[PDB]
């Protein structure tokens, strides 16, 4: 048993919400958020943007700490830092951004991130402002993450499109 209420359940492994994955967070203090990270780690808009905000900045302090150590992250890659007073940790996964032209097939491999860690809080990887089809990317969850995923779609009225579509 954990702590998640009121979540979907697509499949054995994932489980889905309408929720502002900020206010999920601060309310179940989960080991693992994920962030939709850019392989700079600025952390600008979406949920990058809105994370770092409820941190008071302290996620972009470590992030550019982090980033002046090790350099850029790869498309389809993650790092882990710390969850700062949303969570245990933040795994920051970098999902391919159609609107700056990356390949949609590394939304598998950004997904694949999420099999090191026995459960997390997420957003859908390249949706929103990633300009990917939300759809495509919960089609990709589920068949690519094992781990137990808890979904938060931010978008109310998207949130009903992908259960009604969900296959």
């Known amino acids: 048993v954990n702590s998640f209420s ?12 309408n929720a502002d ?18 392989v700079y780690l600025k952390h600008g808009g979406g949920v990058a943007g809105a994370l770092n905000k ?4 302290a996620m972009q ?12 992250l790869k498309v389809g890659g993650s790092c882990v830092l710390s969850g700062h007073n949303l969570a245990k940790h933040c795994l920051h996964v970098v999902g391919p951004n ?3 032209g990356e390949d949609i097939q590394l939304l598998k491999s950004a997904y694949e991130n999420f099999n090191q860690h026995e ?16 759809i495509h990317s919960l089609r990709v969850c589920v068949d690519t993450v094992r781990t137990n995923v808890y979904l ?12 009604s579509s969900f296959l």
Do not use: H, M, Q, R
Not at 22 to 38: G, H, I
Not at 152 to 163: E, G, I, P, R, T
């Open 6 to 17: 009121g979540y979907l359940k697509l499949t054995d492994n994932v489980y889905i919400k």
């Open 21 to 38: 994955i900020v206010e999920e967070a601060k309310k179940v203090k989960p080991t693992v958020v994920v962030n939709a990270a850019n």
């Open 54 to 57: 409820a941190t008071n900045n």
């Open 61 to 72: 302090v470590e992030s550019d700490d982090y980033i002046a150590t090790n350099g850029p």
């Open 98 to 100: 159609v609107n700056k």
């Open 119 to 134: 459960v997390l809080l997420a957003p859908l990887l390249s949706a929103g402002i990633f300009g990917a089809d939300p």
């Open 152 to 163: 938060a779609v931010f978008d109310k009225n998207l949130y009903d499109k992908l259960v």
